[PDB]
């Protein structure tokens, strides 16, 4: 039986920051989805838009496994003790700006989940967002240097409610949310890098009949 | 005969900052008391405010203990060099800037005592902030990372002047602040994540 | 005896900049001024003022003092190997944003000078800022986490013109500034905390 | 066989991030180019613009060539683990704002690939920006300290369209972006630093 | 031969950035000049500027010097191995913005040279920006805490184009420079502390 203590100890140990869990040859397999917390700062003749979300992360790193049988099985870790996916919003205009604790949590199973607070602006199509059909944002996020051999995004589908933690005192309300996974590759390189793709439906509130 | 070279030196040897001082399965007990000092930005449209206020943190951790009947019984930390609670503002649209300098203050008895002044933008209720009933603002803290099994948070609710140390510059006035314990639960773990409800009652002043 | 690299090394090897350098058990004795530079913008609705000033903070380190029969008896620190003063201005609505390298002057007796420029935005009485009268703007400036036991503040009796080394391309000009040493404390805790209040009254240049 | 970790260890392990990677006195050869993603302020008064780019760099460190025969031959690395061109926006008016995670990417060759996406302010012509013919914002980018005997920056010649990344939301279009390679030399000295100039030719998107 | 390599380790394992290079007694001699590279916001009414400027200091460091008969006679380095003159604008009213890689360049006889690009809000006169004349704003630069004694500062007094490098896209253009040599001291303090007073002399450009 192992203490919190410990299981710290021996992550700092076999944990590796800056190298890419890859089991066998296989790539790793990062859940990416987004929960969207408020809609902020929205410029319709710029097309940008301000958002903030919950950023929820989840993929598997063996190497940090324990028995739990007797001990903690999830401690939180700081991300700087772990390795992390080096994932970014292609459309993203500034950089993002996290408003929670940089912690991450990590089960004996090795599972890592880390759901940071974001704040970003982001440059998409904002035209319609004072229509009753309503405007539709993309998000379009994934590994930066990583390919599709290396790491595989995809968005936890599963029908819940999206303005579920959106704030009722925002100015927007969200019409729908839909996450579709996708890829991208250029011309110039063969390796194609997976990304999701969030498509945000919101319009004003209080609009006229 | 230590000093507080040596007591630092000691916690040094003994804080695991990244490490919950969690003794057996008992949770981390933290306090959090807000203390409004400003109000700065309002926005009647978009519900937003900008506020300036201590947040009074305490918790334990008894692994850095020592004898004060021969020493000062306590010390001013940096909290880089210990363990803090990452607590958040569930509702805050901007990362929180500290004021002050980041020390915390560490009694022999291991009872740790932080509490930076902040700055921070959060999206509430603000409609009625231009009536006589004002508006109420609830800013809700808690941890970020540890439920209900690992830590917990009361209010350090008592009594005293809502408005003690509020700036008497600021454009608003608070008519009063109750802080009530609460609790987070989230559609698809059972977990639960204990926090406190600061609801902040101000209007503007010279109601015209 | 040595050379300027023997003393930064000995300071180096000698100072605990985590550790307040309490000679016996008596407070460290800390100095604070501000020589204002600056008054960028200001705002008569929301009371707010942005400010340039030096903040001459003076204390005294005995554990760094060496002899210079033969050696340099000054010079340049950075203040990240010196203990500092965990200073703050109680009603400043910004971080303080030091415009000059960090560098503090350390004497072989022990002395330690550390006077940085300083943008910061502060809440305070802007009423009657295009006056003739003018508006008073009182800046508070005392330890953050150190009681009076620990530490005391005190402005230097000192005479020198107030708008002396203020810009003379400012909208603003200053009328005058008085420092008063001050103390607080609060209903939840014996130890008081010492501050400079420091009330700065300008106007908006007229003309004729 | 050498799992990524042992790679990894090994760049760690020889990498010099502070010293070129000149084989002979030869200089290194480094190519930028810009894939142009958006334009955001558009000031035609001040000429100045906001645009954002991923500025692909690319160059060679022998030193950290490994055998991939039967291990992975492409990782990603940490900037601050390896020695990166020192280029600079010659015309820029602020600090480059790097949006992506700092990482490159080593080929078991020696051959670093760095291709960060970037948002900056420029200085440039915006006369036009509103005709049909567009206005011409040309971007220097080159080494800041190495002259064309240490560092020779030469742009990917491959005709790709212009705005092939460039956002469809954006006020603004790519009407042709021309990346000439050039030079630039001091009334001082002899040596003579090599640059990219990079024209781009954008108007505002009428109605339509 | 040498290699860049052993160049770089040896200022390294000889150089203190925390330890003024002096030479006996005498002060180091510092070089200061400015070339104006583009005028920004500039307004009349608050007397404020913000300027883009590379500032070419340069001093030495005999102890760093090396045999360059057949090895390179200069290489780039991290400001951060070095030690650099604590220069400061006086009269700044923002902390610098460096625009450019922090790299410095020493050369093999111990002479080092420094050339950041800056952009920098400064408070000077402002007045007739709009007339023919033109105004005149002076930047005063020097080092922060050392005096006369330790440091010395010299205009890099050579005719010279003043706008040269200064952008023609710029909503102002350059009448004239002038880079003098000043001295300042404190009433409270014997000694003085050298600077290079910068007066430049810009209007709005128009058509006629
Ligand atoms: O399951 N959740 O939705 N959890 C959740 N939403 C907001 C905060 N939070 C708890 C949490 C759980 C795990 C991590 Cl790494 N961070 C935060
Ligand atoms: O109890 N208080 O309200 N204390 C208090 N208010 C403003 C400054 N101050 C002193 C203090 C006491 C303890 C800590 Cl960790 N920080 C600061
Ligand atoms: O004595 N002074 O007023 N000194 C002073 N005013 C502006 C700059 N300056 C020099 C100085 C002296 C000592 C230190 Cl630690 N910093 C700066
Ligand atoms: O060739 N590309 O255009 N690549 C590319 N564009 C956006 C992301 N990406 C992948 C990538 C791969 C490697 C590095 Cl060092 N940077 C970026
Ligand atoms: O005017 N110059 O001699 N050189 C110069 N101006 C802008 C960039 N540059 C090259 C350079 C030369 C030396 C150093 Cl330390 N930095 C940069």
Same mark, same amino acid.
């Given at each position: ?11 700092? +140990? =076999? ?7 890859? +089991? ?7 859940? #990416? ?12 003749? =710029? ?7 919950? +950023?929820?992360? =989840? ?12 001990? $903690? ?5 700081? %991300?700087?003790?772990?390795?992390? $996916? ?6 993203? %205009? ?7 604790? +940089?912690?991450?949590?990590? #089960?004996?199973? !090795?599972?890592?989940? *880390? ?53 009722? *005192?925002?100015?927007?309300? %969200?019409?729908? #949310? =839909? ?6 590759? *250029? ?5 194609? *890098? @997976?990304? #999701? ?8 509130? !209080?609009?006229? @009949?």
């Amino acid at each position: 039986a192992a203490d919190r203590a410990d299981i710290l100890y021996n992550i700092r +140990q =076999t944990s590796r920051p800056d190298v890419i869990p890859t +089991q066998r040859d296989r790539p790793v397999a990062v859940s #990416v989805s987004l929960k969207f917390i408020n809609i902020l700062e929205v410029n319709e003749i =710029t097309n940008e838009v301000d958002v903030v979300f919950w +950023q929820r992360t =989840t993929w598997s790193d063996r190497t940090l496994a324990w028995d739990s049988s007797h001990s $903690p099985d999830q401690v939180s870790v700081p %991300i700087s003790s772990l390795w992390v $996916p080096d994932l970014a919003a292609y459309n993203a %205009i500034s950089k993002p700006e996290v408003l929670t604790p +940089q912690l991450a949590r990590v #089960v004996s199973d !090795g599972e890592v989940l *880390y759901m940071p607070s974001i704040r970003q602006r982001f440059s998409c199509d904002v035209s319609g967002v004072d229509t009753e059909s309503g405007a539709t944002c993309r998000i379009k996020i994934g590994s930066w240097t990583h390919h599709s051999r290396e790491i595989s995004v995809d968005p936890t589908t599963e029908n819940s409610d999206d303005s579920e933690y959106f704030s009722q *005192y925002s100015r927007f309300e %969200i019409l729908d #949310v =839909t996450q579709k996974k996708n890829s991208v590759t *250029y011309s110039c390189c063969p390796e194609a *890098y @997976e990304d #999701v793709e969030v498509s945000l439906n919101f319009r004003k509130k !209080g609009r006229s @009949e």
